[PDB]
C-alpha cells in the first residue's frame, strides 16, 4: 500500500505497481499523463494505437528540442512522440490493474484510470569515457509507476450544509415590510 | 474573566523575516541583522524591509498578556497549577506539550474547581 | 454629469484637449472624441511636418517592426498625444485608456448625440489671432494617411442629413415657442415669473 494522493473509493478500486523499472522516467511520465483520466478500454486502445504509430503521446512537460508531428494535433500540441518501452510497461500495469479489478468483483465496463503517478527510482550507474582522459556518468533514470483504476459512479446530489442566516433588526424589519406590502 | 486592561496595541504584527529568507532555502526566516557594507537593509533604504528596534516595544501595561488578558503560565501537574489559585484574573494555565492524556483530564478537572482558565483545554482529548 | 461625453474635436488644440481628456479618463469619465481630422496644432504647417519627420526617423535599428510605431491617422496622432499623458503601462492607465474612443469624422451612434467643446482647448480662445496653425487632416495626409477624401465625402453626407434634421427641429421649436407665447399673461405664467421661472 501507501500509494499517492487518492480521492477515490478504496472499496471500488483496483491498483497496480511497478518499482525500480528500467525505463525512462520522463517518457513514462509523459505516457502516464497522456492516459490519466480515461476509460481503461479507451486507454488500452490508445496505447496499442501509439505502438502502431496511429496516435501519439503528447509530450507536455519533458519536451525540449523534441521534433514536431501532426499526430499531436488531436491534443493541441506540436511536439509528441511514441515511447514504446514506457507504453508497454504502462499497459502491463494496466493489465495487472484490470486483473485485480476482476478479482475484487468490479465491473470492467466502468473502469477508468483514476490515479496514475510515476516518480524517480534509484539510478543505475555506469561510466562514460571522455576526451583528455576524463570519466563522466552514464545513469539510467528508472521509475516507480503506480496506478489505481476505479469504478465510475453516478450523481453527486444534494443534502449539504444549509447556511443559517443571521440578519439585523433593520434587515428583518425590511423583510416583513415587503411581505406586508406584496405577497 | 481577566482584569480590566487597556486596549492591546502591538505596533508591528508582522514577523521580522530575514533579508533574502525567501530567495534561498539556506537562509532561514529567523531574524539576523545585515552586516554588509553595501546592504540596503542595514542602510535603511526606502522600500526595503523594516528592522527590529526598540521603538516597537510593547506597552508595559499590556506586555506578555494573551488576548484574553491573562499571562500564560505553563503547568506540568496539579501542584504547579495550584500556584494560580489566588491569581485567576492575572494568569492562565497552559498544560505542557508532554503531559499525557490520563493526566490532563485530572489537571483540567482541578482547574475548573479553582476556576483557573486553561488556554488549551482541547489537547489530547479522547472524543 | 453625462455617462459618455462626446467631444467635437474641430477647432481644438491637440495638447490642451489631450490633457483635459487624459485627466477626465483617469477620473472615470468615458470620452469619445469625434471629428479628429479637424484638430489643430499651433505653429505653421512646415514646423509640425518637420516634427513628424523627426518622430518618423526614430525606430529600432536592429528590427524596425519592434520600434516606435508611427501611426499616421489624426485619431491616432491624437491618441499618441493622449497616451503620453496617461501612465499607459499600468492597470489603472490601461483601464483609463479603455474609457476612450477616438474617431475621425463622426460615425454612427455618435452622429445623433450632442457634441461638446472644451474651451480651455479651443484654438479661437487660446491662440492669439494671427498665430499660424496646422489642421491635423492635411498634416496626416502629408505624412501618409490615406483617407482624407473618404472622410470628406462621408462628412458632407452627414452634414446634409443633419442640416435636414435641424430644419425639421427648428420648425418644431417654432411651433413650441408659438404655443408658449399664448401661455403667458395668464395666471400660472405670472406666478412662475414671480417665482423666477
Amino acid at each position: 500500500a501507501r500509494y499517492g494522493a487518492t480521492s477515490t473509493n478504496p472499496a471500488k478500486s483496483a491498483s497496480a505497481r511497478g518499482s525500480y523499472l528500467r525505463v525512462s522516467f520522463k517518457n513514462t511520465r509523459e505516457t502516464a499523463q497522456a492516459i490519466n483520466g480515461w476509460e481503461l478500454t479507451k486507454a488500452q486502445k490508445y496505447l496499442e494505437q501509439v505502438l502502431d504509430h496511429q496516435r501519439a503521446i503528447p509530450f507536455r512537460r519533458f519536451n525540449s528540442s523534441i521534433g514536431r508531428t501532426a499526430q499531436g494535433k488531436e491534443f493541441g500540441v506540436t511536439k509528441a512522440r511514441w515511447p514504446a518501452k514506457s507504453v508497454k510497461f504502462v499497459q502491463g500495469l494496466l493489465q495487472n490493474a484490470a486483473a485485480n479489478a476482476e478479482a475484487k468483483g468490479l465491473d470492467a465496463t466502468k473502469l477508468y484510470v483514476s490515479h496514475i503517478q510515476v516518480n524517480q527510482a534509484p539510478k543505475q550507474r555506469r561510466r562514460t569515457y571522455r576526451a583528455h582522459g576524463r570519466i563522466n556518468k552514464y545513469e539510467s533514470s528508472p521509475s516507480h509507476i503506480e496506478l489505481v483504476v476505479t469504478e465510475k459512479e453516478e450523481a453527486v446530489a444534494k443534502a449539504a450544509e444549509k447556511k443559517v442566516v443571521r440578519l439585523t433588526s433593520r434587515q428583518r424589519g425590511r423583510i416583513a415590510a415587503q411581505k406586508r406590502i406584496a405577497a | 474573566a481577566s482584569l480590566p486592561h487597556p486596549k492591546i496595541v502591538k505596533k508591528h504584527t508582522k514577523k521580522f523575516k530575514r533579508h533574502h529568507s525567501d530567495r534561498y532555502h539556506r537562509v532561514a526566516e529567523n531574524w539576523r541583522k545585515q552586516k554588509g557594507i553595501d546592504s540596503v537593509v542595514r542602510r535603511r533604504f526606502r522600500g526595503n524591509i523594516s528592522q527590529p528596534k526598540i521603538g516597537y516595544g510593547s506597552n508595559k501595561k499590556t506586555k506578555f498578556l494573551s488576548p484574553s488578558g491573562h499571562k500564560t503560565f505553563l503547568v506540568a501537574n496539579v501542584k504547579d497549577l495550584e500556584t494560580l489559585t489566588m491569581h485567576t484574573k492575572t494568569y492562565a494555565a497552559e498544560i505542557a506539550h508532554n503531559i499525557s492524556a490520563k493526566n490532563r483530564v485530572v489537571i483540567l478537572a482541578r482547574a475548573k474547581a479553582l476556576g483557573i482558565k486553561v488556554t488549551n483545554p482541547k489537547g489530547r482529548l479522547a472524543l | 454629469v453625462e455617462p459618455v461625453v462626446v467631444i467635437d474635436g474641430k477647432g481644438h488644440l491637440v495638447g490642451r484637449l489631450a490633457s483635459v481628456v487624459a485627466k477626465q479618463l483617469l477620473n472615470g469619465q468615458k470620452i469619445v472624441v469625434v471629428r479628429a481630422e479637424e484638430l489643430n496644432i499651433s505653429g505653421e504647417f512646415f514646423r509640425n511636418k518637420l516634427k513628424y519627420h523627426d518622430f518618423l526617423r526614430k525606430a529600432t535599428a536592429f528590427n524596425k517592426t519592434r520600434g516606435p510605431f508611427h501611426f499616421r491617422a489624426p485619431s491616432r496622432i491624437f491618441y499618441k498625444a493622449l497616451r503620453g499623458m496617461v501612465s499607459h503601462k499600468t492597470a489603472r492607465g490601461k483601464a483609463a485608456l479603455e474609457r476612450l474612443k477616438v474617431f475621425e469624422g463622426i460615425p454612427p451612434p455618435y452622429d445623433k448625440k450632442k457634441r461638446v467643446v472644451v474651451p480651455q482647448a479651443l484654438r479661437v480662445l487660446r491662440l492669439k489671432p494671427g498665430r499660424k496653425y496646422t489642421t491635423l487632416g492635411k498634416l496626416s495626409t502629408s505624412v501618409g494617411w490615406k483617407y482624407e477624401d473618404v472622410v470628406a465625402k462621408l462628412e458632407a453626407k452627414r452634414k446634409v442629413s443633419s442640416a435636414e434634421y435641424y430644419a425639421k427641429k427648428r420648425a418644431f421649436t417654432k411651433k413650441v415657442a408659438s404655443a408658449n407665447a399664448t401661455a403667458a399673461e395668464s395666471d400660472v405664467a405670472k406666478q412662475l415669473a414671480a417665482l423666477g421661472y
Partner: protein, 156 residues
C-alpha cells in the same frame, strides 16, 4: 516545573476610578430647529420625507409628526444631526405634545394608545396645515436631489 514562578504577582484588586469632571449640560440646538418647522429626514426608514417637528425631548432627540393622514410617518423620534431644518413653519400651539417624553418611546402589534395620540395630535396639525396652499402636498411628497442640484448653494 514547566515554568518556574513569577517572583512577584500583580494585585488582583481593581483600582477605583478617579473623580472625573465632565458635567452633563443641556444640548443647545442650532437656531434653525424651532418647533413647528418642516424638516427633511435624511436617514432611516422614512428618509426623504417632509415632516413637522414638535418637541425637543430631554434625550437630545426631536419628536416629529410625519402625519399619517399626510405621508405615513407616526409620532417618532429623530436625531437632530440626521435632519435638514427647512424654512417652512407650521404653528404648533394647538398641539398637546407636553405628554411625550423619553419613557413614552420605551421599546420594552401597535399599542392602541399610540394610535390614539397620533390621531389626537393629527387633528390640530391638519387644521393648521390646511390654512395655507400646497403645504399638505409639499408634506406628502418625498425629497430627492435632482441633477444639477448643489446642496451648498441651495437654500432649503
Amino acid at each position: 516545573s514547566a515554568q518556574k514562578a513569577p517572583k512577584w504577582y500583580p494585585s488582583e484588586d481593581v483600582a477605583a476610578l478617579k473623580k472625573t469632571r465632565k458635567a452633563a449640560r443641556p444640548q443647545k440646538l442650532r437656531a434653525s430647529l424651532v418647533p413647528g418647522t418642516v424638516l427633511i429626514l435624511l436617514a432611516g426608514r422614512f428618509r426623504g420625507k417632509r415632516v413637522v417637528y414638535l418637541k425637543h425631548l430631554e434625550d437630545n432627540t426631536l419628536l416629529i409628526s410625519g402625519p399619517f393622514k399626510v405621508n405615513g410617518v407616526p409620532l417618532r423620534r429623530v436625531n437632530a444631526r440626521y435632519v435638514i431644518a427647512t424654512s417652512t413653519k407650521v404653528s404648533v400651539e394647538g398641539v398637546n405634545v407636553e405628554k411625550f417624553n423619553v419613557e413614552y418611546f420605551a421599546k420594552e402589534e401597535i399599542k392602541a394608545e399610540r394610535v390614539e395620540d397620533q390621531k389626537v395630535v393629527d387633528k390640530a396639525l391638519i387644521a393648521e396645515i390646511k390654512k395655507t396652499p400646497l403645504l399638505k402636498q409639499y408634506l406628502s411628497a418625498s425629497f430627492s436631489l435632482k441633477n444639477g442640484d448643489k446642496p451648498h448653494m441651495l437654500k432649503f
